[PDB]
């Protein structure tokens, strides 16, 4: 049954993370089930999320790496590309997934997304509009949410 190669790939990625650990994220299994990981990321410096600590949940499909991992925030975040359920509007998690991408690179792209929001492709139109027309207000509310929920 399918899943054996995916498990091998998951192991490879864990090996990659152990050999070259990122400075601002951690990620891995939290039990017997290797297809479910927890991730922890810091909000990037030079962003309203700076110093915030955000949890994510990662579920690998049985046909990984052909299809992307499911990645969602479990910490509330104010951001035009992330909704109240923690779903993330990021190209590489949807139509632009490449099997050559790894979790470490996904975490990097999520960091880039936090530092440089994409209001052209919002999940939350109200937030994207505030981002476009009043950056200072966007920054204040993003930081308020970071203080409230990411600590």
């Amino acid at each position: 049954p399918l899943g054996s190669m995916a498990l091998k790939r998951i192991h490879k990625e864990l090996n990659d993370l152990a050999r070259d650990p990122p400075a601002q994220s951690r990620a891995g299994p939290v039990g017997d089930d290797m297809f479910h990981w927890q991730a922890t990321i810091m909000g990037p410096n030079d962003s309203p999320y700076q110093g915030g600590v955000f949890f994510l949940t990662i579920h690998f499909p049985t046909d990984y790496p052909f299809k992307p991992p499911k990645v969602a925030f479990t910490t509330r975040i104010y951001h035009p590309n992330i909704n109240s359920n923690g779903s993330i509007k990021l190209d590489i998690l949807r139509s632009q997934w490449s099997p050559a991408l790894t979790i470490s690179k996904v975490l990097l792209s999520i960091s880039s997304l936090l530092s440089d929001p994409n209001p052209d492709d919002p999940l939350v139109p109200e937030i994207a509009r505030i981002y476009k027309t009043d950056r200072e207000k966007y920054n204040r509310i993003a930081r308020e949410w970071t203080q409230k929920y990411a600590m």
Binding site: K89, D120, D121, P122, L123, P125
Partner: protein, 76 residues
Amino acid sequence: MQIFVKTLTGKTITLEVEPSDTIENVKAKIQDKEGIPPDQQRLIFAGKQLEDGRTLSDYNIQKESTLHLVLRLRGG
């Protein structure tokens, strides 16, 4: 005037427009021809995404220009 809109498939959609047409109006024309809701269309010219409340003239889009169309799911 005439403009062209290319999809990711390579399909060209030919539209009759004016420079003063808003991006939202261009999307409405796209919806008439292809059944695609405006909120689910991303229109791109010369690498720049076109904003709904802006016009073709705002982007210097002149006659016989090719625009690119990318689709999103409902809700983005």
